[PDB]
Amino acid sequence: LKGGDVVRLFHAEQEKFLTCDEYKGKLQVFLRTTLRQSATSATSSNALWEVEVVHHDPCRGGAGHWNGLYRFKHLATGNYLAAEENPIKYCLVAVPHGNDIASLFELDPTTLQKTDSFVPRNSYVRLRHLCTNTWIQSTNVPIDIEEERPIRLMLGTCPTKEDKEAFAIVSVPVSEIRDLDFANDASSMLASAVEKLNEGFISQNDRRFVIQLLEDLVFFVSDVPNNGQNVLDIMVTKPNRERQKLMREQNILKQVFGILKAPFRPLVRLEELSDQKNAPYQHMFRLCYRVLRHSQEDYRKNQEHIAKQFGMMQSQIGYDILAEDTITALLHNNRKLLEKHITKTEVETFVSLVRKNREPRFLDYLSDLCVSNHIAIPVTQELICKCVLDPKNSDILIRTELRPVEEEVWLTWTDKNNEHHEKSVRQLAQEARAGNAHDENVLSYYRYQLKLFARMCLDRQYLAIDEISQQLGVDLIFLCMADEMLPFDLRASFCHLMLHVHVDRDPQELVTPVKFARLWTEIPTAITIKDYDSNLNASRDDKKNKFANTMEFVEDYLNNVVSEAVPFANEEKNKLTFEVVSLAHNLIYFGFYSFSELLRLTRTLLGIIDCDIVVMETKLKILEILQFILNVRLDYRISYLLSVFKKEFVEVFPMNMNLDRIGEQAEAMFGSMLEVDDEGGRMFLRVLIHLTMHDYAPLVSGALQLLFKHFSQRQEAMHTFKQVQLLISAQDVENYKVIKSELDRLRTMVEKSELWVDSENYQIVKGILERLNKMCGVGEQMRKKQQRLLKNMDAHKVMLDLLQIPYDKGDAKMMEILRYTHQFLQKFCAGNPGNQALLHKHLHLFLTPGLLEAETMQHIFLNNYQLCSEISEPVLQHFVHLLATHGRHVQYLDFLHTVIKAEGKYVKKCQDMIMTELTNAGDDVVVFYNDKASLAHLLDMMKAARDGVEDHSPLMYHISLVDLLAACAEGKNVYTEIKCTSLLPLEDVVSVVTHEDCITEVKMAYVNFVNHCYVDTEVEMKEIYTSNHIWTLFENFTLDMARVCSKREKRVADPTLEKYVLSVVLDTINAFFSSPFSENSTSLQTHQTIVVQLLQSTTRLLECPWLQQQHKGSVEACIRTLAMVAKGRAILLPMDLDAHISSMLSSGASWDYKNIIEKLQDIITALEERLKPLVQAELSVLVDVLHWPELLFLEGSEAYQRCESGGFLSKLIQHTKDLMESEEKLCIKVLRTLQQMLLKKTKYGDRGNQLRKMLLQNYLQNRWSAIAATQCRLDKEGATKLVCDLITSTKNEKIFQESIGLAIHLLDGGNTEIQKSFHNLMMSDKKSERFFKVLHDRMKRAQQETKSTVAVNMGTSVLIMQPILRFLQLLCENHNRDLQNFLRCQNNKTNYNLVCETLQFLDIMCGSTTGGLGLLGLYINEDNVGLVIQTLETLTEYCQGPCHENQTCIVTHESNGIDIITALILNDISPLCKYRMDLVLQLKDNASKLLLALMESRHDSENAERILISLRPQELVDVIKKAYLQEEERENSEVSPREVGHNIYILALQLSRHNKQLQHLLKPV
């Protein structure tokens, strides 16, 4: 560290960054809080700090020493950090000048330092203020409490020193400093311009200088080298988020806003902008607006800062300032901001201005405003509709008509002069071809008006769809789109309108291609494609009656496109083909096209996309179409197999099956006619491979998904069949029919939401919901059957849409309908994890600020440990934020209570997050009555509710809060137990308990609190056993038991009181008396009478006949513990009561539905068994295709060259890297496929081999060494870099595991090229530290978990070790000295010793000191024997070569792993050898190998004596002799005890050179 260098100070405990900012006009220093998930990423320019050194010469900075005074300066404000009297005694603030001792500071090192050596950068230090001799500290008191959710935190000083107040230094790149300085200069120039504007006098040259400033700022913001384009029209491909944030914090946006506002405040006027005098001012406003547009691109914070000014841009609209385009961009960026900004006056202004200009371009602004992210916004849509469809704006809308004149289309428009002109469309198009400017202008205006109508009608806006449909008929639209004279763009507009108005309408409904649940009677005996399509042919024809000719047009147009030599030669036709393909996709998904027609169309589509944003989108849509056709084919296959099953069942049982006969037809089905393409699959697969190469990410993802699915047809169909459901019983058939009808009606009503929202529709929907509630049924098994039926029906999506329906809080009828819907969802999710998964998929909608949907979410999360594991901190945060904002009722707490527990299992992480959030929120969310006055208020409410407690009472809210807190206490969790102890004192608990009259439920809650937070403490609490709160609680408990018994004697008793006692009091008493901590209680001699009375109360409780049998047994166990405690606590029992206690001790010592189902299940199982090998046979074909993609493409093509160069594989690897974060499943699939490619070839049996031969012959034309060649090819293509990047950056366990597996497979065989590539990557790359740190951290976590399980008595952390150790062994295989030395010393800034980590792992696994003592038999079991063997092999690989440094490290490590290594040989491993002796022999052999490798080539004796110290020669000789004799008892196995003994003998011979006794013993008779 040197003076004049800028760095950042970071707090470890607080995980926050110090900063200085002008909160309310005054500069203040604070520890800003960050809501990000990565503290290191919370870096701001204003948080930069500079270090200044104090020297004798004021101009001399030099380099700071550990004993030199230091000062902290702000790189932006320039003020210096200092401490001043706090109105904590001193508070940190910023001063303008450093000419005072206050700014002086010193850095106390946290660790040892090299005397007065220069301070190293990025070293922990503690700030100390020498001016007043006070130590800096951190506090949670905010400085900006005035604002909700404060971020600024106070940093005071303490007279004493605290070791936790350590600040870490972080370096800063020169780029940040340069950007900050340039931004400051630009801000100064902008301030000068603002001063000129405020003065109202500015020279022409000065204004030109301002324009030049704006141009330079435009260049800087664009970040694109200037190419001569206008700054106003500058184009930026991607903005820089850091630069935008720098501008925002510098307030350059504020400067621009002031520059725009001040002239109109005048120096300039909006009307006067037309004047040449104010033309340069208008140009400067335009520059400001373009700069704002570039600044706010893709930045929500900048968008919010602009929204703060939304008023001024709204006023600026209607003037030549590009406000329209800027506002449209900003509004399209975010939908919520659009909902805030949009207003009816703004819509009217847009209509008025577009009318004023009579230009097409205005309409585009409204068109873009209508939709965002291509997703419609109902409010803006309706607002635009209301203004557009009004007759007043009929002038702007060009009316069109069809007249015979066989038919012709005419257009009438109105000019600004009000003159009306009407012309034929065909004549207008011909005049356009001629080139008339007016005709072109009217055509463009017409096109933009149709585009605006289409965007208005987007997402089924029936409020305005009707009028537009009436104005433009289907026949008119088809005539227009069929007309050839019309330009391609206008035809495309007509096609888009046709798609978005008529085709997408109520009569049409999205059809799910695959139906899981079918009826047995429905199944046809004989099935063909025609029979399959006959199921809904009548409905298809009925719907076709309206749009029949359009399908003919689309089919013919696609035939023409495929016939065309070059598909995408012309862009004007590219637009039209995009529109036509989109229309085809919508028609297909609406189901107009039959299965045979879809198969016919697949050929044309694949030809079109078989050998530009529009082209890429067209290809993507065609891929989606193909996916739909393939899934329809899957459904057809399922139906055919079901038909075969029906035929066989009918034959056998008219009222022994030929399973082989069924299986033959099943195999034949998979295989002909079903094939999408004529070639037989080659066309499709080639299309997919070619698409994978293209740049577009969604296109590549879809191509890869289709390619993977194409080679897994059989397994998917088998899964679908196993999930098929059959209806055979009349009751369930009737239920299915009723559900279908009700769902159809409900879907229609939801679709016409717009019409029936505000009627009879309300009552109809309420009746439908009641019928559904009755339909859901009762009975657990009946419930699961009905849930399966409902999931098959797919009504969940309909109900989710019903919830999505918009509404106003005033509609109580719609509230009741929502309650019915929530009950329906509850019944769907009632004890069904499968259904709950579907709900979690769409949970994003469920996250709303409402009690009823919160309860529904609770019921969704009920009993799902998978969902608890995958829970999200942001979701929990938003829940606690809901509590903080409102905290109205207990349902919020009940949700958290449900989340806490799952399957009677504890998740420590969620509990910790809940406790932390509760503490951070503080008294606002947590309300406690600890204070006497608050307890008095609680007493008042308790007395009011003494007769009864209301279901929404604040008393019950407090009780629920207490229960929630105790639930977090469950689990003997020390970390949260400390917080609970801080939260609530036993003295408050005793006060409230000892109150004369208390609520029974409150008492249960507090006893539960005691049971969890205090009794179940992991760490002994001294206050518990040094305090009398527990004895006061026990006397109260005994009084309560006496009350319960007297009540039952009186025949009048309170179930709440009885439940309180039985449940909480008994458990607390038993836990206390069985507590190991309480075994040393020394006040029991004083409370002898109290404890004896408690035991008497328990005796009476057991004597009571009313006590339940389960309660009786639990009480008997508790009383056994009570007596065991009572033996020696200075308590003498009465004679009769002692006899009764002895009796207690004695007691403690004392057509066929089911036939059809079974037949189907047996057939499914037989088919699965038969087709098991063919699945792998098909899968292997994908590996062969990936190995040889070029054979697919005709030789001599450009694709052939690219494939031969390995381009396809490299693109696959790079795309895997790019998509690891977005499509984790596809990333994992690609990684596993790469592993399969690397793996050795394996035979698949006779049938599998035949299938593979046929598949390869059809797909391809015909055109350890192999493993090494494949490994080298993958390394060249970039597999090594992909693996390194994944291992460094992935946060997914599956991704990490697959990456490590790919590494192991690549390195298999000790490939020197792969090892050298890994070494080069690690050494050259800057992420070597990240890679090694990830591996070392995983190893350390596994070691910690291993210690935990050893203490307890096998964990993903341990299981992940095997691949990591294998990877390290393979890296060091073949005695690679470079790698072996690198692992020990990476020579990086932080060096992690993987060798010592492995040795420590072995030590902890074997038991460390106890293992050395010789408890290896107990410590090692069958499960971990493989891991121990792998660790020993890895250590041997490290040692061999020989690596002298590694050998010395292992022998001299402080863990004494050598002791365990030798103990392994000597110890018998008795528990294991009895059952699995071969593993013990292998362990001993590996240990001997490691010991020999340790002294491979060490001439010195140091290692020999170190080994001999633990390994006495006599034991070694006895082991060798024992092994030789045990040879005879050998059983069949690869390991040989004679070989093990020979290796041990060789080790003994090597050791004997330094030991005379060993030599003498080894000498034979």
Ligand X SMILES: O=P(O)(O)O[C@@H]1[C@H](O)[C@H](O)[C@@H](OP(=O)(O)O)[C@H](OP(=O)(O)O)[C@H]1O
Q: Where do contacts with ligand X occur on this chain (CB under 6 A)?
A: 34-36, 42, 245, 300-301
- Tokens encoding 750: 């939801």
Q: What is the DSSP string of 1000-1023?
A: HHHHHHHHHHIIIIIIT-SS--HH
Nearer to ligand X, 41 or 563 (CB): 41
Residue with tokens 């080679």: 711
- Asked if residue 32 belongs to a known ligand binding site, the reply is yes
Minimum CB–partner distance for residue 300 and ligand X (Å): 5
Strand, coil or helix: 376? strand
Instruction: Give me the phi and psi of 1555, to 5 degrees please.
Output: -140, 115
- Asked if residue 1373 belongs to a known ligand binding site, the reply is yes
Total Cβ atoms within 10 A of residue 458? 20
Nearer to ligand X, 29 or 1504 (CB): 29
Nearer to ligand X, 16 or 1111 (CB): 16
Q: Are residues 19 and 175 in contact, defined by beta-carbon separation less than 8 angstroms?
A: no
Residues 6+ apart with CB under 8 A from 854: 882, 891, 892, 895
Minimum CB–partner distance for residue 373 and ligand X (Å): 15
- Asked if residue 36 belongs to a known ligand binding site, the reply is yes
- Tokens encoding 708: 């993977």
Strand, coil or helix: 960? helix
- Asked if residue 855 belongs to a known ligand binding site, the reply is no
* CA–centroid distance for 1098 within its chain: 52
- Asked if residue 1048 belongs to a known ligand binding site, the reply is no
Summarize the chain as % helix, strand, coil (round to 5): 65, 5, 30
Minimum CB–partner distance for residue 34 and ligand X (Å): 4
Minimum CB–partner distance for residue 249 and ligand X (Å): 8
Minimum CB–partner distance for residue 38 and ligand X (Å): 10
Q: What is the DSSP string of 292-357?
A: HHHHTTT-HHHHHHHHHTHHHHHHHTTSTTTHHHHHHHHHHH-HHHHHHH--HHHHHHHHHHHHHH
Nearer to ligand X, 42 or 234 (CB): 42
Nearer to ligand X, 32 or 840 (CB): 32
- Asked if residue 754 belongs to a known ligand binding site, the reply is yes
Nearer to ligand X, 668 or 875 (CB): 875
- DSSP 8-state symbol, 127: E
Q: What is the DSSP string of 879-926?
A: HHHHHHHT--STHHHHHHHHHHEETTEE-HHHHHHHHHHHHHHGGGT-
Strand, coil or helix: 490? helix
Cα 230–Cα 233–Cα 239 angle in degrees, nearest 5: 110
Q: How far apart are CA 283 and CA 211, in angstroms?
A: 8
Nearer to ligand X, 35 or 1132 (CB): 35
Q: How far apart are CA 256 and CA 1388, in angstroms?
A: 47
Nearer to ligand X, 2 or 308 (CB): 308
Minimum CB–partner distance for residue 245 and ligand X (Å): 5
Q: Measure the CA dihedral 48/49/50/55, to 10°.
A: 180
Total Cβ atoms within 10 A of residue 440? 15
- Tokens encoding 1414: 């010789």
Exposure of 374 by Cβ count < 10 A (0-12 exposed, 13-18 middle, 19+ buried)? exposed
Nearer to ligand X, 35 or 437 (CB): 35
- Asked if residue 460 belongs to a known ligand binding site, the reply is yes
Minimum CB–partner distance for residue 149 and ligand X (Å): 10
Nearer to ligand X, 42 or 685 (CB): 42
Q: Before 109, cis peptide (omega within 30)?
A: no
Minimum CB–partner distance for residue 878 and ligand X (Å): 12
Total Cβ atoms within 10 A of residue 194? 19
Minimum CB–partner distance for residue 924 and ligand X (Å): 20
- Asked if residue 300 belongs to a known ligand binding site, the reply is yes
Minimum CB–partner distance for residue 43 and ligand X (Å): 9
Q: State the Rg of the chain over Cα.
A: 40
Which residues sit opposite 92 in a β-bridge? 83
- Asked if residue 248 belongs to a known ligand binding site, the reply is yes
Nearer to ligand X, 874 or 922 (CB): 874
Exposure of 1464 by Cβ count < 10 A (0-12 exposed, 13-18 middle, 19+ buried)? buried
Strand, coil or helix: 84? strand
Total Cβ atoms within 10 A of residue 1081? 18
Long-range CB pairs of 656-664, under 8 A, 24+ apart, other chains included: 657/1159, 657/1162, 657/1163, 659/1162, 659/1163, 659/1166, 662/1163, 662/1166, 662/1167, 663/1166, 663/1167, 663/1170, 663/1171
Nearer to ligand X, 37 or 521 (CB): 37
Minimum CB–partner distance for residue 706 and ligand X (Å): 33
Minimum CB–partner distance for residue 354 and ligand X (Å): 34
- Asked if residue 640 belongs to a known ligand binding site, the reply is no
Nearer to ligand X, 301 or 1444 (CB): 301
Nearer to ligand X, 244 or 835 (CB): 244
Q: Are residues 358 and 445 in contact, defined by beta-carbon separation less than 8 angstroms?
A: yes
- Tokens encoding 1079: 């075994």
Nearest to 460 by CA among 570, 590, 613, 337: 590
Minimum CB–partner distance for residue 155 and ligand X (Å): 18
Minimum CB–partner distance for residue 37 and ligand X (Å): 8
Handedness of CA 73, 75, 78, 84 (dihedral sign): negative
Residues 6+ apart with CB under 8 A from 399: 411, 412, 413, 471
Nearer to ligand X, 270 or 306 (CB): 306
Minimum CB–partner distance for residue 126 and ligand X (Å): 25
- Asked if residue 603 belongs to a known ligand binding site, the reply is no
- Asked if residue 35 belongs to a known ligand binding site, the reply is yes
Residue ranges of the annotated binding site for ATP are 1487
Residue ranges of the annotated binding site for 1D-myo-inositol 1,4,5-trisphosphate are 32, 34-36, 241, 245, 248, 299-301
Residue ranges of the annotated binding site are 32, 34-36, 241, 245, 248, 299-301, 460, 751, 754, 1373, 1437, 1487
